[PDB]
Design a protein around this ligand. Structure first.
Ligand SMILES: [Zn+2]
Lengths: 79, 5
């Protein structure tokens, strides 16, 4: 209400969060940040600044936008 | 990806 994390509203702030991002994740910080997701600093776990939705266990083939949309259909950012 | 809270 309205945005869950206003400090992660900036795409640059989401990108900056992806320090120590694991090589095993197979999704880039730039793809994740463009879909409104920032790094929590744990495993491959990311969160949306807008809806507060959290996503983990990324697999090769996943698209950041599609996964965000599908699991968080009320999110205004990927609507 | 898996959603969680
Ligand atoms: Zn969202």
């Amino acid at each position: 209400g309205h945005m869950r994390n206003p400090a992660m509203y900036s795409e640059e702030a989401r990108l900056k969060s992806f320090q120590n991002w694991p090589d095993y994740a197979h999704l880039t910080p730039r793809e994740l940040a463009s879909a409104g997701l920032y790094y929590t600093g744990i495993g491959d776990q990311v969160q949306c600044f807008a809806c507060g939705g959290k996503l983990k266990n990324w697999e090769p083939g996943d698209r950041a936008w599609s996964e965000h949309r599908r699991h968080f259909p009320n999110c205004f950012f990927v609507l | 990806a898996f959603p969680f809270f």
